[PDB]
Amino acid sequence: ALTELEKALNSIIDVYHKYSLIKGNFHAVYRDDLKKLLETECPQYIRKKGADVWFKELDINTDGAVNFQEFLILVIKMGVAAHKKSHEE
Amino acid sequence: ALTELEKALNSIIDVYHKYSLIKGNFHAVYRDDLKKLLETECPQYIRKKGADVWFKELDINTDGAVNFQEFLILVIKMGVAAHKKSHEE
Ligand SMILES: [Ca+2]
Ligand SMILES: [Ca+2]
Ligand SMILES: [Ca+2]
Ligand SMILES: [Ca+2]
Ligand SMILES: [Zn+2]
Ligand SMILES: [Zn+2]
Numbered sequence: 252a253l254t255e256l257e258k259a260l261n262s263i264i265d266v267y268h269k270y271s272l273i274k275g276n277f278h279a280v281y282r283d284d285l286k287k288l289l290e291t292e293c294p295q296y297i298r299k300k301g302a303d304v305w306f307k308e309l310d311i312n313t314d315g316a317v318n319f320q321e322f323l324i325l326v327i328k329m330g331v332a333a334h335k336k337s338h339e340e
Numbered sequence: 341a342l343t344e345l346e347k348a349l350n351s352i353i354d355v356y357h358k359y360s361l362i363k364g365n366f367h368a369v370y371r372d373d374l375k376k377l378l379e380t381e382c383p384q385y386i387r388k389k390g391a392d393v394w395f396k397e398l399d400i401n402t403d404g405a406v407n408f409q410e411f412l413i414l415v416i417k418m419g420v421a422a423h424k425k426s427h428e429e
Contacts, residue, residue: 254380254381254382255351255354255355255381256351256352256355256381256382256415256418257381257382257383257422258351259347259348259349259351259352259355260348260415260418260419260422261422261426262344262345262347262348262351263345263348263419264419264422264423264426265344266344266345266348267423291343292343292344292345292346293343293345293346294346319420319423320420323416323419323420326345326349326419327412327415327416329345329346329349330349330352330353330412330415331408331409331412333346333349333350333353334353334356334408337353
């Protein structure tokens with residue numbers, strides 16, 4: 252990671268691995284793991300949607316866990332909301 | 341204090357604005373602007389695809405520019421690709 256964009260994606264990968272390496276499959280963020288991720292990494296306006304609501308949305312293949320590709324849904328939705336709020340009067 | 345995940349998204353937003361503030365509509369990355377972004381922010385396996393190939397692919401509504409939502413398509417594909425490459429070699 253040499254550029255700002257590459258470092259940012261590398262940080263996103265490290266954030267995901269910080270919760271997927273807790274237990275179970277190394278590429279699975281479970282419902283309780285996601286709850287800690289939301290409470291630790293995300294702002295209140297993302298956090299207050301609830302871990303259960305987010306998990307239903309993120310678990311695309313309905314295997315009971317959130318993989319990295321599914322995790323990008325939360326990442327992108329956080330990016331849209333943060334950028335939207337940055338210009339919002 | 342801002343979390344690692346929040347900083348990463350702010351950096352992504354900063355990257356986009358770095359090129360959308362160049363000229364014209366300040367929420368628009370034009371063809372040459374996107375080429376500068378790809379040539380500066382992105383690795384080789386992204387760049388080799390071609391700047392014009394990326395533009396045609398990212399400019400979904402064919403309005404002549406890449407807005408923020410369209411730019412996130414590149415971020416997603418780069419995120420998946422970077423994660424896959426981080427588990428190589
Ligand atoms: Ca796990
Ligand atoms: Ca899943
Ligand atoms: Ca512009
Ligand atoms: Ca467009
Ligand atoms: Zn903006
Ligand atoms: Zn991984």
